[PDB]
Amino acid sequence: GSGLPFLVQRTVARQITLLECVGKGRYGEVWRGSWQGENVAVKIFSSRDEKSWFRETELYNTVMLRHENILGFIASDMTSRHSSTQLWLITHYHEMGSLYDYLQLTTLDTVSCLRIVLSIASGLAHLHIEIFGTQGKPAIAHRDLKSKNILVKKNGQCCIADLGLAVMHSQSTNQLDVGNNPRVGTKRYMAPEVLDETIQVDCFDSYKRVDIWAFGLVLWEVARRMVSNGIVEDYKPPFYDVVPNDPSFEDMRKVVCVDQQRPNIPNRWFSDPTLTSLAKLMKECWYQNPSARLTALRIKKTLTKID
Numbered sequence: 001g002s003g004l005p006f007l008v009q010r011t012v013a014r015q016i017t018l019l020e021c022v023g024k025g026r027y028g029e030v031w032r033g034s035w036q037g038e039n040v041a042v043k044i045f046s047s048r049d050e051k052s053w054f055r056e057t058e059l060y061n062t063v064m065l066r067h068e069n070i071l072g073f074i075a076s077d078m079t080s081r082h083s084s085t086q087l088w089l090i091t092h093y094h095e096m097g098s099l100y101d102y103l104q105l106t107t108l109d110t111v112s113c114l115r116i117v118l119s120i121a122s123g124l125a126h127l128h129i130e131i132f133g134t135q136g137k138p139a140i141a142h143r144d145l146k147s148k149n150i151l152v153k154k155n156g157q158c159c160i161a162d163l164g165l166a167v168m169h170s171q172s173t174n175q176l177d178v179g180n181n182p183r184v185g186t187k188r189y190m191a192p193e194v195l196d197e198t199i200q201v202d203c204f205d206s207y208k209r210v211d212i213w214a215f216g217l218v219l220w221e222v223a224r225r226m227v228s229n230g231i232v233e234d235y236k237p238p239f240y241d242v243v244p245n246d247p248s249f250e251d252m253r254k255v256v257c258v259d260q261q262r263p264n265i266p267n268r269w270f271s272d273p274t275l276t277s278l279a280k281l282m283k284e285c286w287y288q289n290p291s292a293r294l295t296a297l298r299i300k301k302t303l304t305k306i307d
């Protein structure tokens with residue numbers, strides 16, 4: 001699969017030392033660990049998210065998922081630390097952390113903004129594309145794409161993380177694993193058809209289009225932090241002004257379904273050719289009609305032409 005052979009995976013988990021706790025949330029904890037003096041990221045799952053640990057483990061072990069813009073899987077184990085049994089996911093360590101946190105610490109210029117959003121689009125296209133053959137992969141929809149689930153590399157590229165809610169489709173299998181309620185991700189980023197539960201739960205391409213909606217929101221988050229003529233916006237989450245923290249489903253439905261509202265475009269973006277192009281791009285990710293939204297490959301192409 002994507003990481004070490006399973007025999008090595010078990011020995012690796014035992015050979016890891018946990019050094020520093022860099023993240024904690026409802027998902028559990030993330031640690032900087034060390035394997036033979038090399039940094040690794042270790043996510044220790046909460047009981048609430050144990051099923052996501054299992055789903056992500058089986059995905060990465062059974063699908064060859066190696067791509068510069070997807071978080072690099074190393075191993076998964078149910079191991080003991082300090083006499084407690086724990087669910088570990090071990091990946092490449094990205095010292096910069098999440099795009100969410102990174103955007104609050106610094107600003108971007110044209111080159112670094114485009115590098116971020118193109119690398120996300122490239123990772124998303126690779127997830128979404130079904131590749132046939134013995135070394136191919138099922139199509140994968142992420143279902144919780146957002147800035148907290150994107151990591152930043154030292155070179156300014158990003159990679160998409162956290163495949164615990166992902167759904168997969170092969171020409172072979174017919175029954176998607178939609179898993180009952182479609183409202184599984186983060187409410188602030190949910191597409192209208194998820195919020196109002198009209199999404200065709202049996203149609204795999206419906207889930208790709210939900211990802212595209214969320215990507216447009218991430219594009220907006222990032223573009224706010226690109227400086228033009230010494231001007232930048234502060235970091236804010238999508239819809240931060242029109243809904244409260246931890247917004248309810250009903251909060252989101254009124255904004256996105258009834259009123260058909262979208263994040264506001266700052267006026268100054270139309271003084272800059274890159275931000276003007278990005279504004280147009282994100283609007284093509286947010287159409288109410290899911291089938292009108294651009295594909296990840298079309299977004300990737302457009303971003304490549306902007307530079």
Ligand SMILES: COc1cc(-c2nc3ccc(C(=O)NCCCN(C)C)cc3n2C2CCC2)cc(OC)c1OC
Binds near residue numbers: 022098102151
């Ligand atoms: C091993 O599995 C995972 C690991 C990571 C992950 N690696 C990380 C590596 C470093 C850091 C992190 O802050 N260093 C300190 C630098 C702080 N700067 C914000 C300035 C934070 C990391 N994090 C998450 C982001 C919140 C905690 C994220 C995952 O899903 C989003 C994940 O699950 C697949």
